[PDB]
Design a protein around this nucleic acid. Structure first.
Ligand SMILES: [K+]
Ligand SMILES: [K+]
Ligand SMILES: [K+]
Ligand SMILES: [Mg+2]
Ligand SMILES: [Mg+2]
Ligand SMILES: [Mg+2]
Ligand SMILES: [Mg+2]
Ligand SMILES: [Mg+2]
Ligand SMILES: [Mg+2]
Ligand SMILES: [Mg+2]
Ligand SMILES: [Mg+2]
Ligand SMILES: [Mg+2]
Ligand SMILES: [Mg+2]
Ligand SMILES: [Mg+2]
Ligand SMILES: [Mg+2]
Ligand SMILES: [Mg+2]
Ligand SMILES: [Mg+2]
Lengths: 72, 113, 108, 176
RNA sequence: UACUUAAAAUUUAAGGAGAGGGUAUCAAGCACAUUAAAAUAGCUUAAGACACCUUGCCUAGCCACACCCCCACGGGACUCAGCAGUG
RNA sequence: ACUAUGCUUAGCCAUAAACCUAAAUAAUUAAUUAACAAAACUAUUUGCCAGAGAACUACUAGCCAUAGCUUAAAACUCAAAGGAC
């Protein structure tokens, strides 16, 4: 078979790689902010749980782990 | 001595768990007809059963009797009998211990032990 | 698929029928906003008479005006219907001749 | 380690029962036919035979589930010793993990067929059998952290209830 | 409706053999269990839990609603979704 | 001409036309030519597919991955695209 369908994907992937290259710095700031919102949503979801259970403060010796930050 | 309301007056199933005190979680299966294919498949249900003596082990076939009054929200049956014990089956036809499709004790013999 | 696989999935999942320019309604009433010409994609050649309208739903759409010659102007009221103009891409509505301000084509 | 390791003076399994019959054999000949001048594979044939005698009712049969389990316990401990020196051998790490899984499958069938034999084999071979969990549990940082708090929140709520019950009962006792 | 005690119609409550919409890019829910000396650490879930969205269905008919606040002590923007009629 | 790099020691990344483009298992070779390729075909079980493009994309979650990988749409456009000859 011909490679025509592969050529379409070849151009799509090439053009996408250069688009990511152009806006690489913008994408980095988008991600750090999407992860920060991802963390706040995680923290709030944990606060909802204990408040609904009837606790007025989080369980003793508990600190929500920061799981989306540059910990590794 | 009125009997239970529940439809399942007698249910057979396998003991899939025994981590609750004096209770055995049992999985029963029934055959339900697929209307499109007109073939029977297995619909399985979970039944909590009162195991008074904690004499049940995971994997054994058991017979449950519907309790007249529900003991709790989910415990509405008791353990009538253990049809097959896991690994300790006794052949109904001959009465001799078996281990799969074989006799641990020959039916010709009469050990009476 | 095997009978066990057909049983676990059942009948084919059916994508919902998304609505069109009229929002699944026989007709809509709109007020003309502008009258302009659209060019039929190649290989056709014409100066097709179209107009923008604000429909009762509140959105704005481009509507082809059929017939030889229309008197439509801004602020006029028209009854739009479905039916795409094949040569005109994006024009999914048509005006009904003989209703509200739009009138029947003057016969020659 | 394990209670039994074959001595270096022991004969190989081919001549284990033949040299005793022979009236007189030199020290050198015994040393050539001992486990000191043999490969590791020979020392493993002696380890297995010892375990079959001490566990299996009929050591003549090697096709029973109990015997097959014993054959895999020697291999599993052999693969483990290999992997203690060859830390980056990925083919033998696969052999070790696949034999462990094979034993679990055989132990499951043994439990379902002959429970009495199953209990002895696990006690003698020192193999713990854990039953397969009904439901698979996913694991990732977000889940493990939420599941830890939820367990902690519950415990705190229950601890408070116990304290309240004690205080309520204590007040009632004083009134009585 | 009968009898000084029994036949119906019509409802209510607690349930369960089986059946019962969509999205799995909703994959975990977070107390959802059992025992009954009050301890045990359990319960549901890819055989689809939980979440969210959409729709009256079961059709000799049934279900829900009755100005709004799921309810209606209370409060509010204060009543035709009875017939006809109006904006 | 010369560097990153190909090498070694640890750790990471998890992608290939990773394709022999043919899942695994047990058969059967007559009652059997869409074309081409590596003859046809039955049973069992799982996975996957449902016009083309948009799209190895957007968003979501997981990940030692931070110009990344896996997961993977819709609007919109067309009356075809595609395979073999
Ligand atoms: K033309
Ligand atoms: K209401
Ligand atoms: K190839
Ligand atoms: Mg070629
Ligand atoms: Mg392209
Ligand atoms: Mg998405
Ligand atoms: Mg009103
Ligand atoms: Mg009301
Ligand atoms: Mg009226
Ligand atoms: Mg009224
Ligand atoms: Mg160099
Ligand atoms: Mg390298
Ligand atoms: Mg790939
Ligand atoms: Mg290759
Ligand atoms: Mg790629
Ligand atoms: Mg991507
Ligand atoms: Mg992404």
């Amino acid at each position: 078979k011909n490679v025509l369908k592969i050529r379409r994907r070849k151009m799509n992937h090439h053009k996408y790689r250069k688009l990511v290259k152009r806006t690489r710095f913008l994408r980095r700031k988008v991600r750090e902010g999407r992860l920060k919102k991802k963390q706040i949503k995680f923290e709030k979801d944990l606060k909802r749980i204990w408040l609904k259970a009837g606790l007025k403060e989080a369980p003793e010796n508990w600190q929500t782990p920061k799981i989306y930050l540059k910990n590794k | 001595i009125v009997r239970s309301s529940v439809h399942a007056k007698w249910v057979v199933g396998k003991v899939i768990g025994t981590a609750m005190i004096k209770t055995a979680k049992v999985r029963a299966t029934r055959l339900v007809l697929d209307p499109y294919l007109l073939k029977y498949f297995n619909k399985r249900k979970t039944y909590f059963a009162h195991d008074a003596l904690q004499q049940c082990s995971v994997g054994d076939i058991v017979l449950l009797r519907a309790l007249p009054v529900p003991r709790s929200k989910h415990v509405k049956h008791e353990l009538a009998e253990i049809i097959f014990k896991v690994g300790r089956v006794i052949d109904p036809v001959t009465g001799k211990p078996c281990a799969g499709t074989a006799y641990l004790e020959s039916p010709l013999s009469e050990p009476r032990e | 698929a095997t009978l066990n696989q057909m049983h676990r999935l059942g009948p084919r999942k059916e994508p919902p029928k998304r609505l069109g320019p009229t929002e699944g309604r026989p007709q809509l009433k709109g007020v003309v906003l502008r009258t302009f010409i659209r060019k039929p994609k190649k290989p056709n050649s014409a100066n097709r008479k179209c107009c923008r309208v604000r429909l009762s739903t509140g959105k704005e759409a481009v509507c082809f005006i059929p017939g030889e010659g229309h008197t439509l102007q801004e602020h006029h009221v028209v009854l739009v219907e479905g039916g795409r103009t094949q040569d005109l891409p994006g024009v999914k509505l048509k005006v009904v001749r003989g209703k509200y301000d739009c009138g029947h084509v003057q016969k020659k | 380690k394990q209670d039994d390791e074959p001595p270096s003076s022991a004969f190989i399994k081919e001549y284990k029962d033949i040299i005793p019959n022979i009236e007189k054999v030199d020290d050198v000949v015994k040393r050539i036919l001992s486990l000191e001048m043999a490969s590791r594979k020979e020392k493993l044939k002696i380890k297995q035979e010892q375990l079959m005698n001490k566990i299996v009712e009929n050591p003549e049969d090697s096709r029973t589930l109990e015997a097959q389990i014993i054959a895999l316990t020697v291999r599993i401990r052999n693969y483990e010793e290999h992997m203690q020196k060859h830390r980056k051998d990925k083919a033998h790490k696969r052999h070790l993990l696949m034999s462990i899984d094979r034993r679990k499958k055989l132990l499951k069938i043994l439990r379902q067929t002959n429970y009495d034999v199953f209990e002895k084999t696990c006690k003698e071979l020192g193999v713990e059998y854990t039953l397969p969990p009904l439901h698979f549990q996913k694991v990732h940082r977000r889940f493990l952290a939420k599941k830890a708090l939820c367990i902690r929140v519950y415990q705190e709520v229950q601890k408070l209830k116990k304290q309240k019950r004690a205080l309520k009962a204590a007040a009632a006792a004083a009134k009585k």
